[PDB]
Amino acid sequence: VSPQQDFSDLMKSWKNERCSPELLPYPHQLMKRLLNRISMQSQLIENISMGFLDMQNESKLPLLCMETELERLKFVIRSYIRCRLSKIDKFSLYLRQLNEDENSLISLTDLLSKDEIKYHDTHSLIWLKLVNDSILKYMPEELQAINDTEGSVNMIDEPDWNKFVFIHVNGPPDGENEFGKPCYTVTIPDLKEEVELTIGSIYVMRYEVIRDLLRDDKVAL
Amino acid sequence: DDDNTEIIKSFKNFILEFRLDSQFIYRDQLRNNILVKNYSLTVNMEHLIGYNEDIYKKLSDEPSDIIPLFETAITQVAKRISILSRNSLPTFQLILNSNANQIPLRDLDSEHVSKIVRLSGIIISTSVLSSRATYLSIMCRNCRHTTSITINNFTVSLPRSCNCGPDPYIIIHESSKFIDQQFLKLQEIPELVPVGEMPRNLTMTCDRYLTNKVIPGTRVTIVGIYSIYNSKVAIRTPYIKILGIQSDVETSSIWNSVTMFTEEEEEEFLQLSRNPKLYEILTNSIAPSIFGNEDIKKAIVCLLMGGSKKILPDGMRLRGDINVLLLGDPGTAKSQLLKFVEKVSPIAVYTSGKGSSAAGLTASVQRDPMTREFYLEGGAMVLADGGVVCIDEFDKMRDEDRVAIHEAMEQQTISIAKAGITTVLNSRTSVLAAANPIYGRYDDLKSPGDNIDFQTTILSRFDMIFIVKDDHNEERDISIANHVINIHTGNANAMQNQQEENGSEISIEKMKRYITYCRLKCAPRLSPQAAEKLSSNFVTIRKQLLINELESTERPITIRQLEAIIRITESLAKLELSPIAQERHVDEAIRLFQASTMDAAS
Amino acid sequence: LPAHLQQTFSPEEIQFIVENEPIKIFPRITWQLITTDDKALNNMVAMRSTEVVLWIALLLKQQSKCSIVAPQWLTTKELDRKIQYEKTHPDRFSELPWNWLVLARILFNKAKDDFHDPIHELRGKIQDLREIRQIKVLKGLKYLNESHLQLDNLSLLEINELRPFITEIMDKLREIHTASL
Amino acid sequence: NGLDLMSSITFSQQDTNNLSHQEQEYLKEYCDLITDLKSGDLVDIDLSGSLVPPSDVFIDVRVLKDAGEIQTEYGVFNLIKDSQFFVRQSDVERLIQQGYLQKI
Amino acid sequence: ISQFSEAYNKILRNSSSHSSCQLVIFVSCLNIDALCATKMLSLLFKKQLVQSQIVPIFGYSELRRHYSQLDDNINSLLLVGFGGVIDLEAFLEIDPQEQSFRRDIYVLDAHRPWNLDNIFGSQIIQCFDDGTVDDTLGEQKEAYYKLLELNDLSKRKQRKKQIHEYEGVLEEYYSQGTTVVNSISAQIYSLLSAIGETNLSNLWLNILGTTSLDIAYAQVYNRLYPLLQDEVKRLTPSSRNSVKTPDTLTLNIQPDYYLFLLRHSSLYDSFYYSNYVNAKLSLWNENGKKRLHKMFARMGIPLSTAQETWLYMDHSIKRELGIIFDKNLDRYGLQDIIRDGFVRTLGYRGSISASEFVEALTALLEVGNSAQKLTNLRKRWVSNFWLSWDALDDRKVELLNRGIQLAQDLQRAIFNTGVAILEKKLIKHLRIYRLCVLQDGPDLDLYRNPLTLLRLGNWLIECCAESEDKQLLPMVLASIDENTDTYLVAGLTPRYPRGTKKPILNNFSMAFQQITAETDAKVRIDNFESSIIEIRREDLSPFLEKLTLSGLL
Ligand SMILES: Nc1ncnc2c1ncn2[C@@H]1O[C@H](COP(=O)(O)OP(=O)(O)NP(=O)(O)O)[C@@H](O)[C@H]1O
C-alpha cells in the first residue's frame, strides 16, 4: 500500500514487461489506485498553481518539481501498456486460442485490462474484415479458417516459454526454497540438470524454467 | 634510447590522456581496429600539436628516427588494451595525415629532404606486391650462435658478432615475420607545374595496410617523407617513404565498393528516382558549358550507368554499355563535351589518338630489356575497364588493333596470343566515338556511309550513332550566342547554374557517386511487352531500310542494332533504380535512337 | 506499437531507470513538496548531508540550490583497488555500483564541479576499467552455450547495450540443440 | 496521430490513393479504433505522444518556416519563421511531432 | 534611468508563470553587440529558469510588423539596439494601458543621441542608459520641465522666446551626429557583477561583445582592457599547470595583431588580407607586395614559410616572432599592430584570440545558408543568424570553423574587389566628402549584406585614407544586383591612425533624414541603421545631387 512500493512494482511490472517473452497479467489491483492517484494531485497541483496566482496582488521549485513528477510517472505506464497492446496484436490469435478453451486461465478480467480486451477483439475483428474482404473471397474452403491446419502452423505463436532473457535474482529471504551453497534456487532445466542460483548472481536461461520465479517475484529481469 | 623511452612514455601519455569531449578518439580507435585486425591508427597531427607542441617540434625535425618509436609505444598500447596478461601481437602500422600545407612537385629539391611533405600528383602505374622482412633470426655458419634481429624501418646489412667471420649468418626463413611493399610510381598533376616541359614521376613506397589502397591512374594525396637511396656522385635515387596516404576525393570506389553508407544517399538517390525530371536533370548536369544539343546530351547519360549485362549460361555474354558517335561538323562541342564526359566517369582514360596520350590504344606487351622476359605493359583500354572510353581522331586510330577495338567493344575482351602470354584480358569499357567525319558536311550530299574508314561495319559495332548537323540557323543561335558572353565573363551563366543548384540541378561530382552507386546494384530488366514492341518497331525499322533500299542504296542496321537499342532501355532504366522498365520508359530510348535511324535515312 | 527497440531497453531509457536511485546532497536552501514517491521533506537543512532521489537533485543542481555528493565509491584511489582486482581476476568482473557508467556521464555533465579532480583522471580510469572489463566480456563470450549464462557482475548499461547479440543468438543455439531429438 | 488535435489522418500517410482502398478503409477504421484508446484513457494519453522519456525539463526549440500561432491551447507562443524558445518538455511534444518545432 | 538591480528584480516580479510568461527578447538585430549580450542574458534567464521566446528581427519597419503582429498577454518586454533615436510610443501607440501598466518594455543600445522621449515620459520604458550617460544631458531636463507645461502680449513673445531658447537648445540635441558608445555586454556584465555572477565564459562573451566593434574606434574599448584585463586578473584558473588541462583550459592575454586570421591562416595571407597592412603598406600595389617581401627579408623568413600553415611554423619562428617584429615592423610604420588583448583556449582544439573569433561570426551573417523576394531574403539572413547563435556556443566548435574558412572566402572576394576598384580609380573627391558607387561586378548579392559593404567600405576607407593627408572625409557606397534597383547604400566615417582626438559623430544619419524629409521618392528607411538605406537608381542620382546640397557637414 506504500505509494513508493506502488511505483516500485510499477517499474517491476514495466521492466519485466518489455523484456518479457510474452504478455503477463494486468496489475489492475494496484494500478487502479494509481490511475486514480495521478489525477488526484493532477487536480490538486492546479489548485495550488492557480492559488499561486492569488499571491500576485517565489517558490516555483517544488511547483515544477511536482509537475515534472507527473509526466515522468505518466510516461512510465505508457511503454508498459503500449508494449502489451503490441504483444496482444502479435499474439492476438493465441489469445483467442486460450480464450475459446475452458482451461485454464483466460483473458477475463484476469489477464487483460477492459481496454485491452476491447482493443484485442476489435483489432482481430477489423483484422478479419481487412483479410477477409481482400484475400478471402478467393477463400477456398479449408482455407476459410485462420488458425492451425495443422502446419505450418500458424500462430499458435508465440507461447514461447523457452526464450532467453537477462535476469537478476532477489527475495526477502527466510534468512523456503533455499538450498545453498550460499543461496537459492533450483530447479533443473528440461534437458539438463541444476545450476543453481544465488540472488547476487544473474543467471540467464529459458523463460519457462525461471517463470515461476517471476511469478514469485524471486528474480528481476 | 631511454631518452627515446621518455618519448615513448610521452606518446603513451598522448593516447591515454587526449580528449575531444569526452572519449579518447585514438583510444577508442584502437580497440575498434584490433578487432578489424587493422593494427594501425590514423592520427591528426593537429590533435598532436594541440596535445604537446614539443614532441612535434622534435618529430618534424628527424621523424625518421622517431616514427618507429612512435609505433613501439602504441604497439605496447594495444598490449594494455587488447588483452590482459599474467599473442602473437603483430607490430603496428601507423598512418598519419594532416590538412598541412600543399607543396608542388617541381619545386621539390634538397632543402625539405628528410621531412614531411603533403602533396598530390597522380599515380601512373602500380608495382607488383613485394614482400619485405619484419622479424628474422640466424644461426652462425660456424659457432652456431643464435642471433635475433628485429628488422625495423626505415640499407642495413646483417651484423657479424657472436673466424667467426667475416659475417657468418644466413636467414632463418622458416621463423621470420613479414610485410608487403608497393613501390608506387606516381606522377605530378597534369595542370602544374609543367611550364614547358614533361611531367616528372617521383617514386614512393607503401607497406602493410597502405598497400593496394590506390588504383593505377587515379588522383591521390600522399604525405610521406622525402629521402634518398643509391640503387645502381654520390648520385643516389630520390624517393619518398609513405606515411600516411589518403585518397583524393573520394576516391574510395574500389572495391565492391563503398558507400559507406551515410544513409542520406539512399533517400537522396530514391528522391532522384521520384523526381520526374531526374533523367532530364541529369541531362542538365552534363553540360553547364553546352546549351542545346539536348539529343546527344540525353545520349551521354545512359552510357555511364552501364546497361544490360547478362551472363546467361553457356559462356555467352552481351556487353554494356554500348557505344555512341559524336561525328559531325566542328562546332559540335563534342570535344568540349567529351572533356566533360571523362571527368564525369569515376574511372576512365581520355584518348584523342592514335592512343592516349602516348598509350598503345590496346595493351602492347613489351619485353623488359633487363632480365629479358616479356611483360604486359598495360593499355588505355585495359586500365579503363569498367569505365568510359574516350576517343577523338577516330578517323586516325591504329588500324591493327582498331580491330581490337572492333572486338573489345563487343566481346568485352582483348586476346593477346603474342609472345608467351595467351591471356584474354578484360575490357568491359564502353566506347564513345567522337571523330570528325570525312570532309565535314560534304559526306551529306554523298553516301553518308564508308565515312568511317573503308567499311560501314564499324557503325554496327557502335550503337547510338549520331550525326550532329549545325546549320548557321537563326535564333537558336542568338540565344546560345547570348549564352556565350555570359559563359565567359563574369561567368554570368556559371552563376545562373548555382541557383538551379538550389532550385533543381545536380552538383555532378555527385553524379560520379550516383553512377558509381547504381552501377554496383544488380542489372535492371524490361518486362516482356516493351521487348515485343522493340520487335514491331524494328520489324518496321528493318522493313523500312529494305524499302529505303528499294533504290538499291548501299549502307546501318543489324540484329546487334535492335539489341543495341535494348541496352539503352536498361540504361535509362538503371537511372530509375528499378528492377523493371515501363513501356514508355523504353519508348523515349526508342525516340532517342530514332534520330540515328534518320541518320540512316540521310 | 513501440517498433523499437523492442525487447531491449534504450540506453536513453535505462538512464531514466537509474535516475530513480537514491543519493546524498548538500542543500543550499533551508508546500511541501508533496509529490508521490518522495516522502521527504520538511525544509531541508542547508549545507548538510541528506538523502534524496537523483533526478530531483539533478534539477535543483541545475538551479544550483543543492550540491550532489560524490559517491564514496567514486574516487581515484578506489578505482585503483577495483581495477587491480580486475587484472588479478581474469574471470570475475569484480564489484561495482552497477548504475555507474550512467552515473559517470550524468555527474560529469553537470555535477562535475562538486568532485575533486575527476577531470582528465576518472574518465580515463573508467575508460580503461570499461576496457579490461570489455575484453573480459568479449573473452567470456567464447564460452557462450545453451543453456547457461553467468554474467555475474555486469552493469545494466554494459549488459543492455549488448543484449540483442547474446539473446537473439542463444535462441538460435538452444532451439537447434534441443531440436536435435 | 499526430498530435494534438491529430486532427485528421487526411494528408497524413501520403500514399493516399497508392495504398489500396481495402487498406485505406481498414486503416482509417483502425485509427478510428485507436481514438477509442484515446477514449479509454483517462490518463491523459498521449500514447501517440510521449514516446521518449522526459528531460530536463526545459529545452530550446526553434521554429522552421511555420506560422502559426495555433497556440490557443495553454498560452499563445506566437509562432514565426526563425523563432526559438526556452520552454518545458510538456508543450513540446505536439509541435515537435507536428514538424513546427525543431531543436532539442 | 535606473540601476540594473531594480529593473531586473522588477522584471523578476513579472517573470515566472505557466504557460509563460510573459516577456520576450527582441534580438536587434544583425549587429553583434546584442549577440553575446543576449546569450549571457539568455543564460541568465536560463539560470533563473524562465521561459522566453527568442526573436531575431532585421528590418526597422519589421519591428512594427512584429509588435503589432503577436503580443497578447505579454506582461513585460525586452528589446535591443533600437529606439535610441525614434520612439516606439509614437511608432506603436500606446496610448495608456491600464500607472503600474499592464506591460513593461526593456530596450538596450549604445547609439546616441538618445531620443527625447527616452529618459522622460516613462511609459514603455524603463530607459536603460544607466549608468553610462547621466549625462547630464541637463538639456532634456529643460526639454520637458521647461517645455512643460508651457502684460499678456509682451510676456507672450517672452514665454515664446524662452521657449525658443529651449527650442534652439533642444533643437541642437536630437539634431547631431549619431554614434555608438559602449558595448552593452559590459553593462550586462557589470549587471551580472552587481548580482555577483562572473563566468569566464561571460567575460569571454564580454570580450567578443566589446571586441565586436574593435574595427570601429574603441573608444572606451581602449580603457575597456582594464575593465576586462583586471577581470582577467580577477580570474585565476590555477596557480600553475596542471597541464594542460584537457578541460579549463581558459584564456590569457598575448601578442594579438590587427593582422587578419593569424592563427588559422598562412602568415603571408595574414599580412595580405589584413586591413592595417593594406593602406599603410599599399597592398593593391605590387610595389608594396615586393616591399612586403622586404619585411621577410628583415624577418629571415622564407616566402614558402609565409605560404606555410600557422600550425607548422617552427617553434623558433613562434617564440622569436614578436621580437623579430620589434626589430623590423617599426620601419614601415607598422609599430601599431601589436596588442596585448585576450585569447580563449580550447587547448587540444586550439587557441583563438577574441579579435579573430569575431570575424567568422560576421561570416555566417551574409553566407553559410515582388517586394516579397527581399523580405524572404532578409528572412534568409535572419535564418543564418541562428547558425551564428550556435556558433557562439562552444559545444560544436566544428560549425564555427565553417565561417572561419569562409572569412578567407569573404576577404578573398573583398580584397580582390577593392583593388579592382582601385586600379579603376572610382573615387570622386567631390568637395565636402569623398564618395563612390558600384554598378556591377562579381557577387553583388554578397554585397546585399549591410555588413559586407560595411566591412568593405571599412577596409576601403582605411585604404582610401590612412590618412593619406589631408583632411579625412566621410564616405558612401552603393550597389545593385536584383530587385529592380534597391541600390543598397551606406554612410561611413574616417578612422584615425591610432593617434583619436575626437568622437567625430556621423552627420549622414541626419542628412539621409534630410533627403527622406526631402522629395524622398523611392527612398526606403526600412533599414534599422540610419547609416544605410535602400535607394532607386532613378532617383539616387538626383538623391546624389540632393546629397551634394545642402551639405550638412
Ligand atoms: N554549347 C556549345 N555549342 C557549340 N559550341 C560551343 C558551346 N559551348 C562552347 N562552345 C565553343 O565552341 C567550341 C565547341 O567545340 P567544337 O568547335 O565542336 O570543337 P570539337 O568538335 O568539340 N573538337 P573536335 O572533336 O576535334 O572537332 C568550343 O571551342 C567552345 O569555345
- Amino acid at residue number B460: S
Residue written as grid cell 511469478:
A215
What lies within 8 Å, CB to CB, of E553 at 6+ separation is E432, E433, E474, E507, E511
Judged by CB atoms within 8 Å, which residues 14-53 of C form the interface with B? none
Dist. CA D77–CA D68, nearest whole Å? 9
Residue where one domain finishes, among candidates A140, A157, A174? A157
Pairing of strands B172-181, B130-139: antiparallel
Residue written as grid cell 595493351:
B363
Q: Count, in order, helices (H) and strands (E) of chain A.
A: 5, 4
DSSP state of E18: S
- Amino acid at residue number E101: F
Question: What spacing in Å lies between the alpha carbon of B329 and ligand 1's midpoint?
Answer: 10
- Amino acid at residue number B345: S
Site to substitute for ligand 1 among B291, B297, B332, B491, most atoms within 8 A of C-beta = B332
Is B396 close to ligand 1, i.e. is its CB under 6 Å away?
no
Please enumerate, as own/partner, the contacts of E190-199 that have beta carbons within 8 Å and a separation of 24 or more.
E190/E4, E191/E4, E191/E8, E192/E40, E192/E44, E194/E3, E194/E4, E194/E5, E195/E5, E195/E8, E197/E47, E198/E231, E198/E234, E198/E235
The answer to whether the peptide bond before residue B193 is cis (omega within 30 degrees of 0) is yes
Dist. CA B536–CA B489, nearest whole Å? 51
Q: Are E379 and E386 within 8 A, CB to CB?
A: no
> A123 and A182 share a domain?
no
Q: Are D88 and D58 within 8 A, CB to CB?
A: yes
Q: Where are the alpha helices (DSSP H) in B39-147?
A: 45-51, 53-59, 67-79
Cell numbers representing residue A56 in the block: 500576485
Please name which of C170, C166, C163 lies closest in space to residue C5, comparing C-alpha atoms.
Answer: C163
Q: Count, in order, helices (H) and strands (E) of chain D.
A: 2, 2
Q: What is the dihedral of CA E43, E49, E53, E57, to 10 degrees?
A: -20
The overall longest dimension of chain B from CA atoms, in Å, is 99
Q: Do E49 and A49 touch (CB under 8 A)?
A: no
Please name which of C123, C120, C128, C119 lies closest in space to residue C87, comparing C-alpha atoms.
Answer: C128
Dist. CA E362–CA E215, nearest whole Å? 12
Chain C closest CA to A221's CA: distance in Å? Answer: 10
Chain E closest CA to A63's CA: distance in Å? Answer: 11
Cα B413 to chain centroid distance, Å, stands at 19
Cell numbers representing residue A41 in the block: 494531485
Residues of chain C with Cβ-Cβ distance to E49 below 8 Å are: 62-63
With 0-12 / 13-18 / 19 or more C-beta atoms within 10 angstroms meaning exposed / middle / buried, residue B474 is: exposed
DSSP state of B549: G
Binding site members of B: 328-335
> E76 and E158 share a domain?
yes
Dist. CA B336–CA C17, nearest whole Å? 65
**CA closest to B55 among chain E residues:** E315
Please name which of E372, A61, B29, B84 lies closest in space to residue C135, comparing C-alpha atoms.
Answer: B84
Residue written as grid cell 555570359:
B486
Q: Where are the alpha helices (DSSP H) in E215-340?
A: 221-234, 267-273, 275-281, 287-297, 303-307, 315-328
With 0-12 / 13-18 / 19 or more C-beta atoms within 10 angstroms meaning exposed / middle / buried, residue E530 is: buried
Dist. CA B358–CA B366, nearest whole Å? 14
DSSP state of B278: H
| Helical (H) or strand (E) element with B484 | helix B476-488
Please enumerate, as own/partner, the contacts of D11-18 that have beta carbons within 8 Å and a separation of 24 or more.
none
Q: What is the DSSP track for B311-349?
A: --SSS----SS-EEE--B-TTS-HHHHHHHHHHHSSSEE
> E63 and E190 share a domain?
yes
> A209 and A165 share a domain?
yes
**CA closest to C15 among chain D residues:** D53
**CA closest to C58 among chain D residues:** D56
Dist. CA B353–CA B398, nearest whole Å? 8
Residues of chain B with Cβ-Cβ distance to C136 below 8 Å are: 84
CATH number at residue B340: 3.40.50.300
Q: Where are the alpha helices (DSSP H) in B196-292?
A: 264-274, 278-286
- Amino acid at residue number E146: K
Q: How many domains does chain A have?
A: 2
- Amino acid at residue number E5: S
**CA closest to C55 among chain D residues:** D56
Three-class DSSP category at D30: helix
With 0-12 / 13-18 / 19 or more C-beta atoms within 10 angstroms meaning exposed / middle / buried, residue C57 is: buried
Dist. CA B316–CA E517, nearest whole Å? 87
Three-class DSSP category at E178: strand
Site to substitute for ligand 1 among B335, B341, B354, B479, most atoms within 8 A of C-beta = B335
Which among D22, D43, D89 has CB closest to A133?
A: D22
Binding site members of B for ATP: 328-335
Which among D51, D52, D56 has CB closest to C59?
A: D56
Cα dihedral across residues E274, E278, E284, E290: positive or negative = negative
Q: Where are the alpha helices (DSSP H) in C10-155?
A: 11-18, 54-62, 76-87, 100-109, 122-140
Q: Are E218 and E181 within 8 A, CB to CB?
A: no
DSSP state of B129: P
E145 in reach of chain B (CB within 8 A) = no
| Helical (H) or strand (E) element with B537 | helix B528-547
Is B289 close to ligand 1, i.e. is its CB under 6 Å away?
yes
Would E252 be classed as within a structural domain? no
State the best of D55, D57, D86 to mutate against chain C, taking most chain C CBs within 10 Å.
D55
Is B245 close to ligand 1, i.e. is its CB under 6 Å away?
no
Atom 15 in ligand 1: residue holding the nearest Cα: B333
Which among D22, D37, D53 has CB closest to A75?
A: D53
Would E54 be classed as within a structural domain? yes
What lies within 8 Å, CB to CB, of A217 at 6+ separation is A12, A170, A171
Please name which of E200, E191, E196 lies closest in space to residue E236, comparing C-alpha atoms.
Answer: E200
Q: Are E23 and E14 within 8 A, CB to CB?
A: yes
Please name which of E504, E535, E502 lies closest in space to residue E521, comparing C-alpha atoms.
Answer: E535
Neighbours of C22 (CB within 10 A): 9
Dist. CA E177–CA E508, nearest whole Å? 8
- Amino acid at residue number E511: A
Residue B181 main-chain phi, psi, to 5 deg: -135, 135
Site to substitute for ligand 1 among B336, B342, B395, most atoms within 8 A of C-beta = B336
Dist. CA E356–CA E310, nearest whole Å? 14
DSSP state of C9: P
State the best of C1, C6, C16 to mutate against chain D, taking most chain D CBs within 10 Å.
C16
Cell numbers representing residue E441 in the block: 561586378
Dist. CA E231–CA E225, nearest whole Å? 9
| Helical (H) or strand (E) element with E457 | helix E450-464
Instruction: Tell me the helix, strand and coil percentages in chain B, rounded to 5.
Output: 35, 15, 50
Q: Are B89 and B78 within 8 A, CB to CB?
A: yes
Atom 6 in ligand 1: residue holding the nearest Cα: B333
- Specify the ligand 1 atom closest to the Cα of B480: 1
Dist. CA B149–CA B369, nearest whole Å? 37
DSSP state of B370: S
Dist. CA B274–CA B267, nearest whole Å? 10
Question: What spacing in Å lies between the alpha carbon of E341 and ligand 1's midpoint?
Answer: 58
Residues of chain D with Cβ-Cβ distance to C12 below 8 Å are: 52-53
Residue E493 main-chain phi, psi, to 5 deg: -135, 145
Is B290 close to ligand 1, i.e. is its CB under 6 Å away?
yes
Dist. CA E28–CA E78, nearest whole Å? 10
Dist. CA A15–CA C17, nearest whole Å? 9
Three-class DSSP category at E132: coil
Neighbours of A95 (CB within 10 A): 22
What lies within 8 Å, CB to CB, of C160 at 6+ separation is C8, C9, C11, C14
Residues of D with CB under 8 A from a CB of E: 58, 60, 62, 69, 74-78, 80-88, 91
D34 in reach of chain C (CB within 8 A) = no
D23 in reach of chain A (CB within 8 A) = yes
**CA closest to C145 among chain A residues:** A205
Atom 20 in ligand 1: residue holding the nearest Cα: B335
Please name which of E125, E231, E149 lies closest in space to residue E185, comparing C-alpha atoms.
Answer: E231
Q: Where are the alpha helices (DSSP H) in B358-472?
A: 380-383, 399-411, 457-461
Dist. CA B223–CA B207, nearest whole Å? 14
Pairing of strands E54-56, E25-27: parallel
D86 in reach of chain C (CB within 8 A) = no
Dist. CA C144–CA B309, nearest whole Å? 46
Q: Do E315 and B57 touch (CB under 8 A)?
A: yes
Burial B447-468 (b: 16+ CB within 10 A, else e): ebbbbbbeebebbbbbbbbbbb
Please name which of C176, C154, C130, C14 lies closest in space to residue A167, comparing C-alpha atoms.
Answer: C154
Neighbours of B375 (CB within 10 A): 13
Is B327 close to ligand 1, i.e. is its CB under 6 Å away?
no
Please name which of B440, B191, B465 lies closest in space to residue B322, comparing C-alpha atoms.
Answer: B465
With 0-12 / 13-18 / 19 or more C-beta atoms within 10 angstroms meaning exposed / middle / buried, residue B210 is: buried
A60 in reach of chain E (CB within 8 A) = yes
Please give the residue range of the domain that contains residue E482: 353-553
Please give the residue range of the domain that contains residue C109: 1-181
Question: What spacing in Å lies between the alpha carbon of B280 and ligand 1's midpoint?
Answer: 22
Which among D52, D56, D57 has CB closest to C12?
A: D52
What lies within 8 Å, CB to CB, of E8 at 6+ separation is E191, E195
Dist. CA B580–CA B576, nearest whole Å? 9
> E376 and E496 share a domain?
yes
> E9 and E126 share a domain?
yes
Dist. CA B242–CA B183, nearest whole Å? 10
Neighbours of E545 (CB within 10 A): 9
Dist. CA B351–CA B341, nearest whole Å? 12
Q: Do C13 and D57 touch (CB under 8 A)?
A: no
- Specify the ligand 1 atom closest to the Cα of B326: 25
Question: What spacing in Å lies between the alpha carbon of E94 and ligand 1's midpoint?
Answer: 69
Pairing of strands B130-139, B201-205: unpaired
Query: How many contacts, defined by CB atoms under 8 Å, are there between B and C?
Result: 23
Q: Do E266 and B19 touch (CB under 8 A)?
A: no
Q: What is the DSSP track for A73-132?
A: HHHHHHHHHHHHHHHHHHHHHHHHHHHSS-SS--STTTTS-HHHHHHHHHHHHHHHHHHH
Q: Are C133 and A136 within 8 A, CB to CB?
A: no
Q: How many domains does chain C have?
A: 1
Dist. CA B466–CA B325, nearest whole Å? 5
DSSP state of B368: -
Q: Taking phi first (over 0 means left), then psi (-120 to 50 degrees means alpha), and beta for anything else, what does residue B314 get?
A: beta
Which among C31, C166, C170 has CB closest to A62?
A: C31
Question: What spacing in Å lies between the alpha carbon of B337 and ligand 1's midpoint?
Answer: 8
Please give the residue range of the domain that contains residue A61: 1-157
- Specify the ligand 1 atom closest to the Cα of B292: 1
> A125 and A216 share a domain?
no
> Do at least 3 CB pairs under 8 Å connect A with E?
yes
Residues of chain E with Cβ-Cβ distance to D78 below 8 Å are: 53, 69-72
